[PDB]
Design a protein around this ligand. Structure first.
Ligand code: MG
Ligand code: MG
Ligand code: MG
Ligand code: MG
Ligand code: MG
Ligand code: MG
Ligand code: MG
Ligand code: MG
Ligand code: MG
Ligand code: MG
Ligand code: MG
Ligand code: MG
Ligand code: MG
Ligand code: MG
Ligand code: MG
Ligand code: MG
Ligand code: MG
Ligand code: MG
Ligand code: MG
Ligand code: MG
Ligand code: MG
Ligand code: MG
Ligand code: MG
Lengths: 194, 171, 49, 101, 328, 77, 132, 138, 538
RNA sequence: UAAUCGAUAAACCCCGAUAGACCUUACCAACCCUUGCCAAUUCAGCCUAUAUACCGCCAUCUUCAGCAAACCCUAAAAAGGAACAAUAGUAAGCACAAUCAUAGCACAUAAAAACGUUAGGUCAAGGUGUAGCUUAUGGGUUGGAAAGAAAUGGGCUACA
RNA sequence: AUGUAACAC
């Protein structure tokens, strides 16, 4: 007993909305799509293949759940979740006076059962040295203490930490390195007078 | 070793060796006979040698309006169903080893005098069941080519006739 | 883990949810060989007998 | 079943390598340092030589995971070149194509 | 297959309406480039063959033009040249020869009445006229032709067009006339730029063998060139490379009237010198008038050098040289 | 996500000085152990319990082998 | 002669699918990839495990839909969920289609420890691109 | 015309903790084909303009990783078959952006990531000073 | 379900079949996982999903009683074997292991119940708060309330209090056995409620819900103490349950058939209901939407159905109706109301929203669109719903052929729709002549359709094909097609009609004969008229 | 020598090997184990023979343009099938061509190159038909694989 | 200048 039904194209209305049909990621099922779409290399007398029984349309990624009207609806839904950026921090220079420390961290996404990427442990802490209370002699001791991590042109200090298993432990170790450099830069010891 | 194995089409194509160089020119037919049997014929899809009885493949979903449970037949039922399968296999073998008798026209091995029934209908829908066609000569004719060397071309001569006075011959 | 792969797929083959054409081919060829009469001997009978 | 007895022996060799991997590290730490006394170092050579043979990382052979070819294997896919070509010409691997420039 | 074409037309219209619905645009102004970017957004195939990408167009454009039914229900053919095998092509030759005979008869009547009121309009060379390609004539006649038949038809068309011309016959001929685009190798002269009280400075880009060169030149200074912050003599010790730096200025007799500064990256010394030479040549077009720009073109300054190092082939040594081939 | 490394902080991973308390303070044992603990501080892939296991293995090794340190030529505790 | 992933020219009667009708040098020119996943990029890891999972999926679907499977699978990997896209003939009852769908879903979810989707399109016969 | 009523049920709880501020957030997507990356760029820019982010997108140069393999099974080293992997990059720069907006934008982009691509996010954030540095000296 | 048209279920039986097939596939694959756990031991997912691991149904330690007891309890027979193994080695089971074993016996499973009772009380003085709990919910299923009352007495000797489920099952046990006196059980329920207040236990939602469940199956006029119970619920501040509200609707529905005062009380209280978002925290909330639609289908009102549909749509759509069976009951009576108490413009618009999506029609909702279009005089709408009912209604089609086709003669036929009429006739009368009782009413309808369409030969062929089926229509059809052939001047058809009517003895053969003398006088065929008379007299 | 194998005219000779100190290793000498990887199997396992049985992957003619299903004709037909001012040839298709890549055309390169020939290479990537073992042609451990009387191919460094 | 002796439709 064989049964055959016409697809959803005949029952599809003119003014029906598409995000109600396609909520999430889909394999481009051709029965629910009313568009006659053709892809494939044609024969010299032939035409490209239609949407039924075609694996190239099954291979291709689809943006049918990302139609622009659906983008407007979804972003109007996410509008309640977002918060406003401060008006006083609009400029890079005022950001430089207010928040001098910037921290580069990375998160990675991949298709697979495993989440962990070993390069995700890295933490790169950058500080402009003009925003601190280092003295002259303490500043010179800071450059001779840290060496290559300080840029002589743009006057920035960059500490990259890798050794800790977690990004929070790397962040704590980097900010610990910054504060121990600050506390040990001011110390004048007995061999510093020679 | 599960990744190592292959597909039945590849296995049969490597087994019968129909594309080999022996059958190409005519070098074959000395000691060459391979038979292809479809192994997916008598499969009930859910049949297994342990004998598990599945609610969708082997037996239907609903009994007395209720939902059936996953069950297993008895061992005695297992050699009964296995006996039915293997007896189907020698039934297929008995049907396969039976050969149709070839009606001889003039001699035992020649094609002279053998009839081929009515000729094929034409493009206009005309159908000729009253004519009969007979082979008078079969002859293997060879040709010399640049690539293949010997090129065997079978030519035959037949006659058609309805028995009412209309007859013809062709090659 | 090829052992677990082969064991799982063999158990599915005998439980009749997966159908394996290659082991079907080996079973049919061994059946034809035993029908012809040239099979695998018992362990220990080959050399002295 | 693995496809070959060489594959089976390499699985066992990797197993004893993981089982004894820490002790080789601990002994070779004593071995590869010149601050340690030589009287201790020759002893450390004695317990590194008394270890089982198949626990060493140099006995680990990179074979194909499909057909166990001993050589011609790409390290990224762990596949032999014939099997890699067989899956690559059928388009079963993403991003791999016949090269044209 | 006519009803198939009508079905394709109507479901193409319905699918166009659904595509306008799912984009949220105006369906009355929804056009073919909108369809193209719509399909390129919704089904984004990255494929090197441009014909293998997903398309939804007019079914008349996609489906090939088909032969109609050639006979009635009684078996009688509609057209009187059906038994020639090529009815449309031979009807076209019949119509062309009928027009040629009518032209000859009308011109004989005009000769008898002693009037020559026609003119030779065969020369459409300022328009850039060409006849139909055999593929285009096959598409028009919806039938396969041959090169000999095509040459026969074109020489009959020349026979018709070389005669005195009537308006109907010129309208018949101009169906088969095609126009070429504009043929010109004249470059676009970049206008001079004035910036912060500096007069007549120009900019040029050069590329030769991986070396990219920016050259900016001032017409208000003396003759010196500053390459990458150092002097040209220090940067290019090679006298040949300094001659490459000379060559456009000595070609235009303006060696000391321009002050240049340069930024070149990549390649070696001769590649950088050639890139700087091409960049100075392209930068000097603003100062220099049009006939001397063409003189530059036939001197070969303004044309880029396509000689790029080839790829090494597998089984070979240096992309031409193979290994030592042993005969036995 | 899901791996907190048993709630450990960076000070248990970096500074291993509190497990070096029972060692000969002036010999080559301190040299060897500060190289080892510098390696354990630099290593990202290894857990703190296994680092304690490595230090206790080294302690156990130097505890079983005592006489060879005496005939080495330097006296170590 | 080049013989990889090609169908040989017979008398003119063998039906051919679009993927079998194109030579491997048409991959990413005219035909695409039957599997899409992350691990084959430039600076990305874990390609071999995805490769062996790909292989085991091809053999398991080929033996799980015996004869009613038309042609090669489409295997999509997108944020740990694995989409298996199939062309299946109208051979078996839809009872048996849904039985095998639920069975394959639960079995592969518990075997690769990841969420699985089984997406099917069921066709009358093998789709013919050329010859015939 | 069958309209279900009161579809909205949000759960937003505002904590007393100050929200994290990011200076910049770089999204580098890598893919195999250009059209998917182009359409995904259009999607991301449209979501960015409706969220009010005012972003800049640039294309980093591609790199191609090439290798050579043997053509035959047994012995033919003169004739080789070469393979090619193509990766393409698109980079989104996100400037002057907050924490909850960062989270919801990133997860909306992440759940709408297609099958054949990957991406890295690089977050540089705003933090004034630790509590042991501000103005003490030992 | 997969929305591929081969896999789209045509009917509700096919929908249930496909869903249970997928569930059987899930159960079969999980059976494979639990049968062979060693093949799934390897973990690839690093965040380590615990539900994806295979589950062990085996006891961990075999011969140790204190572990093996609870191990075989947490999986009936195994718990009994573990208890027997603990008892045979003189190992004393404590008050917790015996409680778990008694709970495992009561959750699964009548002489073994008394044996388990002797096991509970004879060996150890096991605590009341497990022992009476287990046994009193056991003899609810095992039908023995006297022992439950005896355990209640034994509990009240031993100073311990009675919880909410105690008075639940005990009010059920006292109420369910009635020997010709309902007041003696109602007063006992009142005394148990008073002692529930006395023993310092707060009476829960399901306590008064269980009292109402007791009140349901005895009196139709026992709804006054049910209303006082409902108001006592609203007094104490606990939000009332939808099972309770369903049971109130059940009594007031039983009272609805004599008088509608109970119905207006229902409508007032649901008018109080309709403004709240709902959280179904009760297990018995399944038949609520069944009964609240049953009262509306009984009293034929629809604005109430509008706001109850909004109530279904408001909080959460699917979690308040338990089964697909009661869900198609809901939608069938919902369309039974909406078809005739609203207009066609919204009826056809919710027709395409509900019927091809939610459930496929049964016969009660098949007949009613047919009577609604016949009331509203809508003839254009017939072929599309016929093509729909061909899909969803193959079972009821032969039973409802006449009731489908009875609309076709009530209206008048303009000449624009004759293609649709001819197709709707031709598909039915090709399918049921290619095979099946087929009535003559459809012959009347098809003949008046081709009479209005002006086609004589196909209608004559159809009547001739019906009279090859060894039965005849009535003579009004014969006169109607005789008028059709009289307007078209066809004498041989009239000859065949009258000959095969006189051979089959119609009662109005005299009228047919007089009509064909009129026909043959009009067409001047009086010689063949006299020939027909000669044939009839022979 | 106790001590692998294959290739071995163009189309072998830094060739399987984009790779041998043990491992790889299939070789040899000593020792050992025979339901001996697996859920099960009067069964596993074999780098044992046949590339003259094969599939899979290729070399060569070859940057040669031809191959071929289905028809038609020849005062027979083994076979052949064209004359453009045209004298029997139509021909779906595969090759060539066209298209595509080397991020703009163009050129060039790459890629492609049909049917077939050399019973051309590969049972040792892997599976396999047939023919041979099953206390051994199978499975493990240890130790060893020399060497140049000579000839020759391809390279590197030079002879300034 | 030559190249013997086991090809099967
Ligand atoms: Mg004979
Ligand atoms: Mg093997
Ligand atoms: Mg190695
Ligand atoms: Mg060179
Ligand atoms: Mg060999
Ligand atoms: Mg040899
Ligand atoms: Mg040779
Ligand atoms: Mg050895
Ligand atoms: Mg060796
Ligand atoms: Mg061996
Ligand atoms: Mg060969
Ligand atoms: Mg050989
Ligand atoms: Mg040609
Ligand atoms: Mg010929
Ligand atoms: Mg052809
Ligand atoms: Mg191009
Ligand atoms: Mg070219
Ligand atoms: Mg090439
Ligand atoms: Mg080409
Ligand atoms: Mg040979
Ligand atoms: Mg073999
Ligand atoms: Mg060489
Ligand atoms: Mg001689």
């Amino acid at each position: 007993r064989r049964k055959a039904l016409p697809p959803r194209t005949e029952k599809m209305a003119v003014d029906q909305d598409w995000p109600s049909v396609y909520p999430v990621a889909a394999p481009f099922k051709p029965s629910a799509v009313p568009l006659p779409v053709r892809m494939g290399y044609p024969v010299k007398r032939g035409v490209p293949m239609a949407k039924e029984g075609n694996l190239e349309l099954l291979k291709i990624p689809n943006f049918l759940h990302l139609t622009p009207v659906a983008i407007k609806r979804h972003c109007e839904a996410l509008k309640d979740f977002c918060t406003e950026w401060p008006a006083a921090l609009d400029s890079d220079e005022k950001c430089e006076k207010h928040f001098p420390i910037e921290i580069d961290t990375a998160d990675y996404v991949s298709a697979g059962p495993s989440i962990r990427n070993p390069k995700a442990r890295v933490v790169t802490l950058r500080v402009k040295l003009s925003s601190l209370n280092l003295d002259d002699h303490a500043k010179k001791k800071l450059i001779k203490l840290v060496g290559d991590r300080y840029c002589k042109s743009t006057d920035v200090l960059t500490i990259k930490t890798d050794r800790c298993p977690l990004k929070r432990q790397n962040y704590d170790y980097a900010v610990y390195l910054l504060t121990v450099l600050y506390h040990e830069s001011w110390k004048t010891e007995e061999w510093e007078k020679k | 070793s599960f990744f190592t194995k292959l597909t039945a089409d590849e296995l049969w194509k490597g087994a019968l060796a129909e594309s080999g160089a022996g059958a190409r020119k005519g070098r074959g037919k000395r000691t060459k006979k391979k038979r292809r049997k479809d192994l997916n014929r008598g499969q009930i899809i859910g049949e297994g040698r342990h004998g598990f009885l599945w609610p969708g493949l082997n037996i239907p979903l609903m009994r007395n309006g209720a939902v059936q449970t996953i069950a297993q037949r008895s061992k005695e039922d297992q050699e009964k169903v296995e006996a039915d399968m293997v007896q189907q296999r020698e039934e297929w073998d008995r049907r396969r080893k039976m050969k149709v008798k070839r009606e001889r026209g003039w001699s035992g091995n020649t094609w002279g005098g053998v009839s081929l029934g009515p000729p094929d209908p034409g493009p206009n829908g005309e159908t000729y069941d009253d004519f009969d066609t007979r082979i008078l000569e079969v002859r293997n004719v060879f040709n010399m080519t640049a690539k293949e060397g010997r090129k065997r071309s079978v030519r035959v001569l037949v006659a058609v006739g309805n028995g009412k006075g209309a007859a013809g011959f062709a090659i | 883990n090829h052992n677990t792969y082969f064991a799982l797929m063999g158990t599915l083959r005998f439980l009749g949810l997966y159908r394996d054409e290659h082991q079907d081919f080996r079973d049919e060829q061994l059946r034809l060989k035993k029908l012809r009469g040239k099979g695998k001997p018992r362990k220990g009978e080959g050399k002295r007998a | 079943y693995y496809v070959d007895w060489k594959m089976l022996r390499d699985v066992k060799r990797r197993k004893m390598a993981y089982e004894y991997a820490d002790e080789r590290l601990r002994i070779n730490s004593l071995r590869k340092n010149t601050i340690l006394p030589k009287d201790l170092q020759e002893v450390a050579d004695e317990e590194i030589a008394s270890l089982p043979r198949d626990s060493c990382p140099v006995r680990i052979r990179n074979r194909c995971v499909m057909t166990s070819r001993p050589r011609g294997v790409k390290r990224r896919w762990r596949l032999s070149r014939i099997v890699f070509r067989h899956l690559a010409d059928h388009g079963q691997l993403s991003g791999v194509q016949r090269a044209m420039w | 297959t006519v009803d198939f074409i009508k079905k394709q037309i109507e479901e193409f219209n319905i699918g166009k309406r659904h595509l306008a619905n799912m984009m949220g645009e105006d369906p009355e102004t929804f056009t073919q480039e909108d369809i193209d970017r719509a399909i390129a957004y919704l089904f984004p195939s990255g494929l090197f063959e441009k014909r293998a990408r997903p398309i939804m167009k007019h079914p008349e454009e996609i489906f090939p033009k088909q032969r109609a039914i050639q006979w009635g229900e009684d078996g009688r053919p509609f057209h009187f040249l059906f038994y020639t095998g090529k009815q449309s092509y031979y009807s076209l030759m019949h119509d062309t020869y009928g027009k040629l005979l009518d032209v000859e008869k009308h011109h004989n009547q005009l000769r008898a009445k002693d009037l020559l009121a026609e003119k030779t309009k065969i020369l459409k060379d300022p328009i850039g006229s060409r006849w139909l390609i055999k593929e285009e004539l096959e598409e028009m006649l919806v039938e396969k032709l041959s090169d000999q038949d095509y040459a026969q038809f074109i020489r009959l068309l020349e026979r018709l067009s070389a005669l005195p011309c009537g308006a109907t016959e010129e309208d018949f001929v101009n169906r088969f006339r095609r126009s070429i685009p504009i043929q010109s190798k004249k470059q676009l002269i970049e206008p001079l730029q004035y910036d912060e009280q500096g007069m007549a400075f120009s900019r040029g880009e050069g590329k030769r063998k991986t070396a990219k060169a920016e050259v900016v030149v001032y017409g208000q200074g003396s003759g010196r060139i500053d390459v990458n912050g150092v002097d040209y003599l220090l940067y290019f010790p090679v006298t040949q490379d300094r001659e490459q730096l000379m060559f456009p200025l000595h070609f235009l007799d303006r060696l000391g009237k321009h002050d240049m500064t340069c930024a070149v990256s990549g390649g070696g010394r001769s590649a950088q010198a050639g890139a700087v030479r091409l960049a100075m040549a392209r930068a000097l077009c603003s100062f220099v008038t049009e006939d001397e720009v063409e003189w530059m073109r036939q001197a070969g300054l303004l044309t880029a050098d396509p000689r790029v190092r080839e790829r090494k082939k597998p089984g070979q040594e240096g992309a031409r040289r193979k290994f030592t081939w042993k005969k036995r | 996500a899901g791996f907190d490394d048993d709630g450990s902080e960076f000070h248990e991973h970096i500074f291993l000085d509190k497990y070096l308390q029972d060692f000969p303070k002036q010999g080559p044992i301190r040299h060897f152990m500060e190289l080892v603990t510098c390696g354990l501080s630099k290593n990202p892939y290894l857990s703190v319990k296994q680092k304690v296991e490595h230090i206790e293995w080294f302690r156990n090794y130097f505890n079983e082998k005592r006489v060879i340190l005496k005939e080495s030529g330097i006296q170590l505790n | 002669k080049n013989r990889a992933a090609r169908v040989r020219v017979s008398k003119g009667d063998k039906p051919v699918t679009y993927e079998e009708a194109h030579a491997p040098h048409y991959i990413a020119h005219r035909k695409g990839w039957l599997s899409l996943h992350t691990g084959n990029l430039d600076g990305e890891d874990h390609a071999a495990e995805r490769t062996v999972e790909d292989v085991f999926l091809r053999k398991f679907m080929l033996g799980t839909f015996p004869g009613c499977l038309a042609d090669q699978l489409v295997l999509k990997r997108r944020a740990n969920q694995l989409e298996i896209c199939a062309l299946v003939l109208r051979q078996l009852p839809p009872h048996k289609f849904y039985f095998l769908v639920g069975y394959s879903e639960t079995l592969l979810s518990h075997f690769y420890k990841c969420p699985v989707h089984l997406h099917l399109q069921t066709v009358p016969s093998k789709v013919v691109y050329k010859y015939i | 015309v069958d309209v279900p009523k009161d579809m909205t049920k949000p759960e937003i709880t505002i904590s007393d903790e100050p929200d994290t501020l990011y200076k910049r957030l770089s999204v580098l997507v890598k893919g195999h084909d250009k059209a998917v990356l182009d359409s995904y760029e259009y999607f991301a820019v449209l979501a960015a303009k409706e969220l009010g982010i005012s972003i800049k997108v640039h294309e980093p140069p591609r790199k191609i990783e090439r290798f050579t393999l043997l053509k035959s099974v047994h012995i033919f080293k003169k004739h080789r078959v070469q393979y090619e992997m193509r990766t393409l990059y698109r980079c989104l720069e996100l400037e002057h952006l907050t924490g909850s907006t960062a989270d919801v934008y990133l997860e909306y982009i992440q759940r709408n990531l297609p099958e054949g691509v990957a991406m890295e996010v690089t977050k540089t954030k705003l933090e004034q000073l630790p509590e042991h540095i501000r103005k003490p000296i030992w | 379900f997969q929305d591929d048209p081969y896999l789209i279920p045509t009917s509700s039986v096919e929908s249930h079949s496909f869903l249970l097939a997928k569930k059987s596939g899930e159960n079969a694959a999980k059976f494979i996982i639990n049968s062979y756990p060693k093949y799934f031991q390897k973990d690839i997912a690093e965040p380590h999903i615990p539900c994806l691991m295979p589950e062990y149904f085996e006891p961990q330690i075999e011969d140790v009683s204190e572990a093996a007891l609870q191990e075989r309890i947490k999986l009936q027979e195994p718990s009994a074997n573990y208890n027997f193994q603990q008892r045979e080695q003189s190992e004393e089971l404590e008050e917790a292991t015996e409680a778990d074993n008694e709970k495992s016996k009561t959750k699964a499973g009548t002489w073994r119940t008394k044996n388990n009772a002797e096991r509970i009380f004879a060996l150890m003085p096991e605590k009341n708060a497990h022992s009476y709990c287990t046994m009193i919910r056991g003899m609810v299923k095992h039908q023995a309330p006297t022992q439950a009352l005896n355990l209640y007495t034994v509990l009240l000797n031993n100073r311990l209090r009675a919880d909410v489920y105690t008075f639940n099952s005990l009010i059920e046990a006292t109420a369910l056995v009635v020997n010709e006196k309902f007041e003696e059980k109602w007063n006992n329920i009142l005394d148990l409620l008073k002692q529930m207040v006395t023993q310092n236990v707060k009476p829960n939602l399901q306590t008064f819900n269980t009292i109402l469940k007791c009140l349901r199956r005895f009196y139709a006029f026992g709804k006054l103490p049910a209303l006082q119970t409902l108001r006592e619920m609203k007094a104490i501040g606990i939000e009332p349950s939808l099972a309770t509200y369903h049971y109130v609707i059940q009594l007031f529905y039983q009272h609805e058939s004599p008088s509608k005062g109970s119905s207006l009380i229902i409508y007032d209280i649901m008018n109080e209901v309709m403004g709240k978002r709902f959280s179904p925290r009760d297990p018995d909330d399944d038949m609520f939407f069944q009964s609240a639609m049953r009262v509306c289908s009984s009293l034929r009102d629809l604005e109430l159905a509008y706001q109850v549909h909004g109530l279904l749509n408001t909080g959460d759509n699917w979690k308040l109706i338990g089964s697909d069976h009661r869900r198609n009951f809901y939608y069938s009576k919902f369309f039974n109301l909406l078809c005739f108490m609203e207009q066609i413009d919204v009826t056809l618009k919710w027709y395409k929203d509900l019927i091809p999506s939610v459930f496929f029609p049964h016969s009660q909702t098949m007949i009613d669109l047919l009577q609604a279009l016949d009331v509203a005089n809508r003839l254009d709408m017939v072929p599309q719903i016929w093509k729909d009912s061909k899909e969803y209604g193959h079972t009821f089609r032969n039973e409802l052929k006449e009731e489908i086709l009875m609309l076709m003669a009530r209206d008048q036929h303009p000449p624009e729709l004759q293609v649709a009429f001819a197709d709707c006739a031709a598909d039915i009368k090709s399918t049921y002549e290619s095979q099946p009782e087929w009535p003559a009413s459809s012959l009347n309808y098809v003949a008046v359709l081709f009479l209005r369409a002006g086609r004589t030969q196909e209608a004559w062929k159809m009547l001739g094909l019906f009279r090859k089926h060894n039965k005849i229509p009535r003579a009004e059809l014969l006169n109607e097609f005789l008028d059709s052939a009289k307007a078209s001047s066809s004498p041989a058809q009239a000859i065949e009609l009258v000959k095969l009517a006189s051979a089959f003895s119609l009662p109005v053969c005299e009228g047919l004969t007089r009509r064909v003398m009129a026909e043959f006088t009009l067409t001047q065929e009086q010689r063949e008229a006299l020939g027909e008379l000669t044939a009839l007299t022979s």
